[PDB]
Write a protein that binds this ligand. Structure first.
Ligand SMILES: [Cl-]
Ligand SMILES: [Mg+2]
Ligand SMILES: [Mg+2]
Ligand SMILES: [Mg+2]
Lengths: 265, 264, 266
């Protein structure tokens, strides 16, 4: 597994954005052969989204034939509610680019059969063959999306009960827990692993235990992210604060192995 | 991988038995499409067998279209002998339920070609497609069936030489010299090929195995840890087996699986 | 995974040779159906090559229908240069046996398309189906061939930049002149290695003690590539006593007893 050690989150976002553009332009997407991109939400990928937008503004990439899949959506919340995952993506990304409505895919949190909605999504992915690049972040406990630790590595898109901790964390909702959704639809670990490439963004001191588990730890189902060690092409892009629990030699190792790719970041 | 932390072995057996009944009833087996169930022997699964027999007597499940496969059998011991694995399965389980002779499968320890016998067993499993649910226990050193620690994850059904410790253990039931030297056993790959694996684990002497299984990483010295790579594996355990786990670990799964725990 | 604990490298070599002989003669190779053998270079496999030669001279095995692939080759260096992997293989093994020229496969380090040459090499391997037995060594840090630690387990045959440590090491064979030492090598990938039907890794010396520990007692871990062999269907490590220094007493005791029958006479 690749590690990209950078100093600040801003550089992480730039490197991640540069990496996404590199892959799009090498792929040469067309209407028949779209580039298929998996996408996350939250504070971490936000620097990436703004780097991408400016790169697009500068004429360095088009999303006209890029198809996207997001990892998550709240169950029960209006799609156009400002706190929906859909809203996060449109207001922080899609609205700023030349992406096409038909090429955007998000889980529908408000159908009358969650199982069927989750299956529809998996089928849609499979209809393109394979996700070309999947971006994500990682929980403090190494989890991915709303998949619990000890999630099966072959787990698929399904409904998840939000943890008590997550719910009180997300109390955007007028400081009210009763308004926070109890369930989310989320992609599975197997759904993730099926991507041709996985790129995980890791920033902040709070993720230091998770990075250690992912980089120096061994394959362990309690730290879901460590499973990427078995994936054919996986990248982690990280900042200096997230490296605190690593050995000095570990950082030295990857900083030098990736030296050529770190230049200009 | 799932962990079901329960108080005592009695509840483990009942939980496992309920889960087997759920799967059978969800599957709706028929003559054409039987339910295929992998089975272990020994003290631990005994509770499960007895609860199953009760549920069946209560009208809660039928084994008429259930096909079974066992993990092991001794080499050289008469099938009808009281200490055979065949005898264990009939005297403690099969004789009590509506299962059909033609759907019971066990290894034959007394052919003139063990390699072919083992091959025959694998072939028959594959004539049903897959094993739908495989129940097992686990060694103190995390091994499965008669597979050695450090067994290949792709190991198949084969003859195995019994360790002198296992043979010493069984001396009560025979004098060391009349205790069998070899067993036929399914491989780790045989096991992993199942749709679902349920491993029952009870007692203070399995705490290191459980630790390795749940908190440890994937390691060929603890065969059971490979379950972490299985699509659907679940471990059902008792309090004495959790002594080497962290408090937070037990707490995690106890609360995660709470809705599946109630009643047990 | 199998661990064969032996006293000294001499016996490790004789064991590995006899295992290679055992697999060839059970396979019974012909023109139509050759035995495909993957091979390493260096001081450690040397003892195996010597014992293989003595076994062949006494009439115990024939390489007439044995097909070979090697792990590595320097980029930019004449293939007949004494320090090429080709030269190692020929001078220490191939010149001494009844192997056929057309059945020998090595990477060409001197084409104008390294990617195309690595692709050609993978294609040739697949044209035989599988490598029946792949013999290798391990780095002090657990790496395989010229694959970096943290190499994808799916990595394929490709060009690799030598670390300065390795280039410092090989400067002796280029007469103390690092500026003579090759900058690149072509190497089979970890996915390439793992595709073999069987993998046998030789581990000798006190300096491989940590790699062997990571490999045998450690868990599956991309920083120690050799630990992925825990996931391979049929892997064996043959090792000497110096290499076991970081293992537990009981770990050596277990495999020594487990493999006692296959150890006798070694
Ligand atoms: Cl080395
Ligand atoms: Mg637009
Ligand atoms: Mg009956
Ligand atoms: Mg010759």
């Amino acid at each position: 597994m690749r590690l990209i050690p950078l100093k600040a989150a801003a550089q992480v976002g730039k490197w991640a954005a540069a990496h996404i553009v590199k892959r799009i332009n090498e792929f040469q997407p067309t209407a028949e052969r779209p580039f298929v991109l998996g996408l996350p939400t939250g504070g971490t990928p936000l620097a990436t989204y703004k780097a991408l937008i400016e790169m697009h503004k500068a004429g360095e990439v088009s999303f006209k034939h890029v198809v996207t899949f997001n990892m998550d959506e709240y169950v029960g919340l209006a799609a156009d509610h400002p706190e929906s995952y859909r809203s996060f993506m449109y207001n922080n990304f899609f609205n700023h680019i030349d992406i096409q409505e038909e090429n955007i895919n998000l889980l529908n949190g408000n159908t009358d059969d969650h199982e069927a909605e989750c299956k529809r999504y998996e089928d849609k992915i499979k209809s393109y063959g394979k996700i070309n690049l999947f971006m994500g972040g990682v929980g403090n406990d190494g989890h991915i999306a709303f998949n619990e630790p000890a999630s099966s590595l072959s787990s698929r898109t399904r409904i998840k009960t939000l943890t008590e901790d997550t719910r009180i964390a997300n109390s955007f909702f007028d400081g009210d827990i009763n308004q926070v959704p109890k369930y989310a639809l989320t992609i599975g670990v197997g759904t993730l692993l099926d991507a041709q490439e996985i790129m995980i963004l890791v920033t902040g001191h709070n993720k230091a235990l998770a990075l250690q588990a992912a980089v120096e730890g061994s394959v362990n189902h309690l730290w879901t992210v460590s499973a990427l060690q078995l994936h054919p092409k996986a990248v982690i892009v990280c900042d200096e604060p997230s490296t605190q629990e690593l050995k000095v030699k570990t950082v030295k190792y990857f900083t030098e192995l990736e030296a050529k790719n770190i230049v200009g970041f």
